Amino acid sequence: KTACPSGKKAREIDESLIFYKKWELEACVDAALLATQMDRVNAIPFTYEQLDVLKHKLDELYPQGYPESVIQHLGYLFLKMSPEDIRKWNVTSLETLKALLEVNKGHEMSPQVATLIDRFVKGRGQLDKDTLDTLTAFYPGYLCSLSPEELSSVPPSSIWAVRPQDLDTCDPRQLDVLYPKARLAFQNMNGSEYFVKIQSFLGGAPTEDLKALSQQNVSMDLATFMKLRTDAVLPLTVAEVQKLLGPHVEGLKAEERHRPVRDWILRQRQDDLDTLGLGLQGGIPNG
Amino acid sequence: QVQLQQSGPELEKPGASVKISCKASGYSFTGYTMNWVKQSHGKSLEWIGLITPYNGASSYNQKFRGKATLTVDKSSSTAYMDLLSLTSEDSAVYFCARGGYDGRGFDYWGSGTPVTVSSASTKGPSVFPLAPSSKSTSGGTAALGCLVKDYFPEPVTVSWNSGALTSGVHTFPAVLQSSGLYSLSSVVTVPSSSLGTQTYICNVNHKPSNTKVDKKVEPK
Amino acid sequence: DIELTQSPAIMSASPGEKVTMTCSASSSVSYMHWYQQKSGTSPKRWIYDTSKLASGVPGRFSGSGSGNSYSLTISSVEAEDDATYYCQQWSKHPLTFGSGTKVEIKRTVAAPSVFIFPPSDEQLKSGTASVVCLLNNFYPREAKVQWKVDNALQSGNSQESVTEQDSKDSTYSLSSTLTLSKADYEKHKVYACEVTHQGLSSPVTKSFNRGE
Ligand SMILES: *[C@@H]1O[C@H](CO)[C@@H](O[C@@H]2O[C@H](CO)[C@@H](O)[C@H](O)[C@H]2NC(C)=O)[C@H](O)[C@H]1NC(C)=O
């Protein structure tokens, strides 16, 4: 019944079309009209079957991929999309991305969303500060979900989007990839500001920057000290650890059998560990 | 199986509002439409509207716009209809029903939620026995019964012997009295030879007033 | 809105007869659905997409039609088909139902079984009295109950209720309750209900003396 029943041709995309059967929709609704009024479909109570007919017509119209004009309003049609189709998309507006990420909010990242993110970043040429803000907002563990190789392609300018808690899942490899980028982003700052910004990254910092910070009265939180690289705290002197921890040197004895602290103590002489007056023990015996 | 479990009877005063529910079971209701239908006692059916849960979209019969608001909780696979600014004309039985796959009508209906709009307070029934006698006997068949008097609002649920007794039973429609209260009767015809051995109990239930009564009817 | 008019509004068919009911629409409708509803029950889908029978519907039922006229046909009416049938148009928003066609079953005449129940002692203790008069299993539906207290014809103090057509017998039942105060009830002695029906050659009467 290719022909559309008389008086049933759709001049407009409205709710009156919900009582059209699938074939009635295929025969009575022109694809260009749908493309122009996509913005109305998400407010109409169309069944999954009728929405399938609609997506079929949208495909008929755009065989080279949808335009962002239609992709912004896809709504729950973005779920009936295939990754192959999304790989042909040119999505540029952050608001389009925010609208598509809101359709499957809460649930785990679907393959469609991964492909959308990849196409978006490959179009923008990088992972921007704004784009990273968006992605972390929708998916909090996004940053630490990237390999140390992928994480290496992040420009330093976008580090201003990385909040401290966004690194509470990153492994030492990722932290080591990130610390230079944050060092560059926060470079050109002065004193307490640099530290306030780089404290959450120092878990991937080397020994040289640690000594440089010690020589500038930083008063490093001991909880931050516990997050440092064991291999990077060993080559430090008692005077350096003292200048770094500032007044927080008191908590050393409380953390005397823990990751970095015990390994550092065991590599120091008791004659110098006793210079702190805190009662530390485990130093290389004199002689 | 597919089941649409509706909320219970409701009583509300004019100008107020109520919210009735429809729990869907046996299928993923995210894809189907949920329609609501109104039926006033002694009248025909009237479509209110429909809702799709995946996007919570809703389409209404213009008559019932501003009167019925459809919502959905996908977590519990439940649909809700909120009836607003209640008047007397809103007193009726409201069904929920699932739409077919390709517009194939309403294939699974709910059980019906009664909604009564009145300024009258709820009152529980008084259950009295209609005992069998010689004037209730006519050819080896006797008639026993229960009288559920002075209650409001409807409905009332009457059974016999916890449902085991069904044949010969007649539970008549309730009649409204000048006092504003309902009263109905439930009778059953039985063999006269059993009245001495068979126990006959009528089980009445009025949910609006949390009243459950089991009344044994005895001869003489 | 499409206005669907059903005809006949009431149908009375003897078992074995072929019957046909019609739904007339104000405008052309692509499809029509037919639901069966029996009193005190939710409507059930009987025919969908104009002519397809729903799961479990007997084969004697059929649906057809087009444009402005649709119809539902029962080849051999059986006593289990007494009910109201509603048509629904699935063409133009909004959905609209028909006023319904109610199907009753014809059967041989059956006179009523009359019983009378005096007021229980519990109710009298409560302060009211209700005398019940039961007409059990009769046909046709038209019957006349008339209360009489000490041969005095009563009026305005009685209420009647009729049941729907039984599934087994295709018979109706009726109950008439006469309500009074304990004082008014104790003022008199004889209480009778007189029943007039097509199946009774002359009025029947069932009575009792208060106390005896
Ligand atoms: C996305 O953009 C690409 C590149 O701009 C589009 O492919 C180009 O299409 C134009 C014609 O519209 C050709 O002249 C170019 O040679 C194409 N370039 C490449 C690399 O393919 C593509 O059509 C766009 N996709 C959309 C709009 O969905």
Numbering used by the authors:
A (entry chain M): 299 to 585
B (entry chain H): 1 to 220
C (entry chain L): 2 to 213
In the authors' words:
The tumor-associated antigen mesothelin is expressed at high levels on the cell surface of many human cancers, while its expression in normal tissues is limited. The binding of mesothelin to the tumor-associated cancer antigen 125 (CA-125) can lead to heterotypic cell adhesion and tumor metastasis within the pleural and peritoneal cavities. Here, we report the crystal structures of mesothelin that reveal a compact, right-handed solenoid consisting of 24 short helices and connecting loops.
The structures of full-length mesothelin and its complex with the Fab of MORAb-009 reveal the interaction of the antibody with the complete epitope, which has not been reported previously. Its Fv fragment was tested as a carrier to deliver various anticancer agents to target cells. An anti-MSLN recombinant immunotoxin, SS1(dsFv) PE38 or SS1P, composed of the Fv portion of MORAb-009 (SS1) and a truncated form of pseudomonas exotoxin, was developed and evaluated in clinical studies. Because MSLN is highly expressed on the surface of many cancers, it is now considered an excellent target for antibody-based immunotherapies.
